[PDB]
Write a protein that binds this DNA or RNA. Structure first.
Ligand SMILES: [Mg+2]
Lengths: 175, 138, 109, 190, 199
RNA sequence: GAGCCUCGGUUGGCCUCGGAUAGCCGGUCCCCCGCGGGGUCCGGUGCGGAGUGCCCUUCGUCCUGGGAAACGGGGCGCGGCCGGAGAGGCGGCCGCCCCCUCGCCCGUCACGCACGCCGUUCGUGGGGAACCUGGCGCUAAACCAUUCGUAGACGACCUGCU
RNA sequence: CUGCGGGAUGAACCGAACGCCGGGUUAAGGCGCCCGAUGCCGACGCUCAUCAGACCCCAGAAAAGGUGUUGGUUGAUAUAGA
RNA sequence: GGCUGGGAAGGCCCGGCGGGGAAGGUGGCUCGGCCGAGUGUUACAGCCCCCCCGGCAGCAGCACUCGCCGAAUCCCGGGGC
């Protein structure tokens, strides 16, 4: 599985009806996937991992993207992880600060890949929950919980190094 | 020795991006290199904007860190950020760059003639002043 | 009374790492360093001017030692302002890193 | 991670006058003037308040390694202020069993010669850092006093004269001989 | 029509790649003050690398072996040559256009020299990283003329200070003279500031 | 003045040191040092307008006929004073003759107007070789041959000879 | 018995198979210079090596350790004062 | 054209309910000229934010370009080889 700018999809599915069980129950899951085609595959993978259901023996009842309810508010997201290392698997809890839940999940994937060299296929997303300012364990998120937060830009290394390449003036880093 | 800080209500100038060359005010900080921004009086909606593409000026209006896009506009209008920005040397230099960009060939010819006369007059005056200074030194 | 052509440099032929196609030349126009300012120069006539030992004819003038190879700008080349050009005869490969003048009068503006 | 802001303040006395040339602290007082360039540290050196009562150092977006510089610069400034106000005096005692150590200052205190160390005919001439003056202490049979304004130079000279008297090719645990620093104090205690 | 570049504060490979690319395009490039070149990493790393390069020699006949030039200008020249097809006629012709100097020679001591922001240490290197000066590295591997270069550069800087003082006086007198006759150039100044000048 | 070969080009920038958790410009009432430098303080800018995102020069000619500006330029203009030694190879500062009214705005026409068609426009009196004008200065050395052994397989090397 | 693009180099690897050409687009691979192309105002983190690291075949390393640094799991005590 | 018969947002807001940052307030302390600036503590809202009851044209995947899938629910014009 690859990763891009992930979107949250709600997928509802059930096993195909049979004369023994006329009305099978409906199951839903939260799947973060680049598109719906891979969202269905991830839903089937997780359902087969949990229930005795396969794609051939079941069907997808509803698949739809879940829009962010408050895209304009900054929120703290807690994500519970289940990934595989070179050694055995481990359980993790990570906190991220983003405007959207899908953005938080993308940040979680990027951070896991950067810090533990874990690919997307090895990572299972268990639960993503928005959290208030309190109940945050990671000081990195907590240090931004300040109404009177101040910080300058000390070392602004200039870009456009190849905009006109030869100049008589050396650049400036203090602004 | 820093005089510019990322404060709630700081006015920032967007160097590059979709809303390039437009003023905007910082609402809340999202992360180390990302903050919630809002530009109601400068045709900029409320969305995240990285610190890389913004250079903040010396204008700071006071409003709560999570105002709902309405009180920030009121503070912007009361402080009259547009007029103060237009009075600054920064906006004047930006407008000079734009005027240079939009200058046509006829205008270039007029500027050439104007400089041709003006530089000669100024250099004649400079030579006279140099001669006077040399006379004074001796 | 002055210069009416833009300065360009014959950077090389269209090529891969180990194969070279001599029927298309790569030009480096001065002042153009992005794949957005090359739209102006598309279709512009380009010439490679050189002198030789023997005299040749000259339109509207006495015979001289100057000979040229005329060409045409075809398309941009890779985000850096590089321009692909095609000439009626392939360039001698002696002009690598030499002056090629691109004219201004396939005007369409 | 990156700490948003880390800072520490130094409360200087009214006697000391301190100025900063961007990131170079110049400290002058009763005993003299001390200079130390705090470049290559990338901190915000702020001098706030009238009469320059307090010196503040700031560090924005620094990791664990860059964080200790905030405390180390404050410690260096504290040592510099103490030296410019009270100074640093190092007392060291020469230890021997049979051969007595003969120490003589030569120019004023800068050139020190050590004689009869374990009976060695060789005499060690040790030069000290500028601004430090050595002397032969009184009221003690065998003691030396090192005085100066900069703690670094005095301590370096003390280390030089400690390492000058070293026993070679013998059990150092048995042959406990040489000159060792015994007390690290100030010239004036007040 | 000739590029003159000041080597102080520029990284070795970062400047070398750009200079080689410009040289291959028929441009004449002059690199000046090659003792100001700096290389990333601590001084001991680069010292060990140059010593390891010094170990490389032909066992049977070191005269035919690699040529270990000690001058910083020649070190930069070799680094640039490593980025050119010097075995071909085109590469040799391009390399002939390059010219490097230790210090700033009199032919170029009275010229304005450009800097490449894409090769500067302040831009490309973190402030917390360590670097080594090419002059000190060369002096410790066989260079002979570091002190002479330093003395000549000090004299050149004194001369440049005198010239810069004269330039300051000239510019200040120019600015005052503009104020003196500002009434006779009002119409010429208004049209200049209409199209984006003097603003 | 022709006369062969070889090419690149198609306005120049004649310059501080420099730091990047900082810098640029003046006056410097004040102090010190040799018109200038250094320090304190004060006042202006700093996404650099005392910006290479820049500056400098115009790239049609000639007639006369007005206004603004104005003593500027040229005759490889002729004679003196210098700076420059890193690989100087360039400029600065003064004396005397003659000539021109050049830059900006408008009147006034005339310039093979070659009737649409490409290498136009220059650095260049370019660089190398051979021949036609004058003024000012020139007079050989090297090698072979001979000689000697401080040298040597032969070359080579150290030496002597109006 | 098989050329061609890439893997610097090359039996078997990756892509893809061959008449002579013009234009366009791709695969596998790449875009600091050699060397065509990131001369993106690329995004998020990690890493200092006085043996750094840098892409299937493939051209090299193990057990065991490190408060060097960066995340996670569990367990206690701390204003009745660690 | 569809969607959550799009999610949020913009404007006048009206009659309420509770909760939380911790402010024209108080206040131990600190820095300057009652005020300006910085920290903490219970903390209603005259700085605000969030949920629950309900309703107005003002919308439209919006040139205030905050993130979709698209085309008998799709057509026109121009440039280069
Ligand atoms: Mg020509």
């Amino acid at each position: 599985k690859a990763s891009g700018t992930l979107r949250e999809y709600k997928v509802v599915g059930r096993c195909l009806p049979t004369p023994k069980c006329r009305t099978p129950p409906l199951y839903r899951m939260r799947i973060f996937a680049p598109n719906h085609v891979v969202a269905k595959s991830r839903f089937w993978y997780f359902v087969s991992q949990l229930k005795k259901m396969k794609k051939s023996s079941g069907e997808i009842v509803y698949c739809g993207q879940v829009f962010e309810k408050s895209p304009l508010r900054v929120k703290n997201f807690g994500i519970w992880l289940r990934y595989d290392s070179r050694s055995g698997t481990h359980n993790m809890y990570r906190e991220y600060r983003d405007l959207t839940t899908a953005g938080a999940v993308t940040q979680c994937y990027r951070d896991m890949g950067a810090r533990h060299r874990a690919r997307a296929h090895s990572i299972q997303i268990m639960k993503v929950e928005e959290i208030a300012a309190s109940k945050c364990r990671r000081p990195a998120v907590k240090q931004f919980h300040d109404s009177k937060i101040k910080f300058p830009l000390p070392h602004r290394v200039l870009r456009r190094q190849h905009k006109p390449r030869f100049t008589t003036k050396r650049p400036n880093t203090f602004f | 020795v820093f005089r510019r800080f990322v404060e709630v209500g700081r006015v920032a100038y967007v160097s590059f991006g979709p809303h390039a060359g437009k003023l905007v005010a910082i609402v809340d900080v999202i992360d180390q290199n990302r903050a919630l921004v809002d530009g109601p009086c400068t045709r900029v909606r409320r969305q995240a904007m990285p610190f890389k593409c913004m250079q903040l000026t010396d204008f700071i209006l006071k409003f709560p860190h999570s105002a709902r896009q309405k009180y920030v506009r009121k503070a912007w209008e009361k402080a009259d950020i547009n007029t103060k920005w237009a009075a600054t040397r920064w906006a004047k230099k930006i407008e000079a760059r734009e005027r240079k960009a939009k200058m046509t060939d006829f205008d270039r010819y007029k500027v050439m003639k104007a400089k041709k006369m003006r530089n000669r007059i100024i250099k004649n005056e400079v030579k006279k002043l140099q001669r006077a200074a040399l006379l004074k030194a001796s | 009374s002055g210069r009416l052509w833009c300065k360009a440099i014959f950077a090389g032929y269209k090529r891969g790492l180990r194969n070279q196609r001599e029927h298309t030349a790569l030009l480096k126009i001065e002042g153009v360093y992005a794949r957005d300012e090359t739209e102006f120069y598309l279709g512009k006539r380009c010439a490679y001017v050189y002198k030789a030992k023997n005299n040749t004819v000259t339109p509207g003038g006495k015979p001289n030692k100057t000979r040229v190879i005329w060409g045409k700008v075809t398309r941009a080349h890779g985000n850096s302002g590089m321009v692909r050009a095609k000439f009626r005869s392939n360039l001698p490969a002696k002009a690598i890193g030499h002056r090629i003048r691109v004219m201004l009068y396939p005007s369409r503006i | 991670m990156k700490t948003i802001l880390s800072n520490q303040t130094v409360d200087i006395p009214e006697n000391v006058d301190i100025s900063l040339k961007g990131r170079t602290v110049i400290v002058k007082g009763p005993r003299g003037t001390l200079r130390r360039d705090f470049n290559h540290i990338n901190v915000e050196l702020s001098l706030l308040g009238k009469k320059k009562k307090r010196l503040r150092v700031d560090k924005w977006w620094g990791n664990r390694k860059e964080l200790a510089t905030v405390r180390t610069i404050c410690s260096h400034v504290q040592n510099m202020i103490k030296g410019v106000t009270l100074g640093f005096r190092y007392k060291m005692r020469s230890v021997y069993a049979h051969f007595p150590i003969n120490v003589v200052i030569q120019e004023n205190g800068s050139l020190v010669e050590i004689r009869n160390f374990l009976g060695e005919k060789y005499i060690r001439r040790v030069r000290m850092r500028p601004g430090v003056a050595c002397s032969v202490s009184q009221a003690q049979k065998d003691e030396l006093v090192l005085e100066g304004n900069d703690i670094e130079l005095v301590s370096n000279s003390a280390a030089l004269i400690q390492q000058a008297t070293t026993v070679k090719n013998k059990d150092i645990r048995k042959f406990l001989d040489g000159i060792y620093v015994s007390e690290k104090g100030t010239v004036q205690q007040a | 029509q000739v590029l003159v570049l000041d080597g102080r504060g520029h990284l070795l490979g970062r400047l070398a790649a750009i200079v080689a690319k410009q040289v291959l395009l028929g441009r004449k490039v002059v690199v000046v003050r090659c003792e100001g070149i700096n290389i990333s990493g601590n001084f001991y790393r680069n010292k060990l690398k140059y010593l390891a390069f010094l170990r490389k020699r032909m066992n049977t006949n070191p005269s035919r072996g690699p040529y270990h030039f000690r001058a910083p200008s020649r070190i930069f020249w070799r680094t640039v040559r490593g980025m050119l097809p010097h075995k071909t006629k085109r590469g040799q012709a391009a390399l002939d256009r390059l010219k490097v100097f230790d210090g700033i020679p009199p032919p170029y001591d009275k010229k304005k020299r450009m800097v490449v922001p894409a090769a500067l240490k302040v831009v490309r290197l973190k402030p917390t990283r360590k670097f080594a000066y090419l002059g000190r590295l060369a002096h410790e591997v066989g260079w002979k003329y570091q002190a002479v270069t330093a003395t000549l550069e000090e004299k050149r800087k004194e001369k440049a200070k005198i010239h810069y003082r004269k330039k300051k006086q000239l510019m200040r007198l120019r600015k005052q003279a503009e104020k003196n006759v500002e009434k006779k150039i009002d119409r010429f100044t208004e049209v200049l500031k209409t199209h984006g000048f003097l603003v």
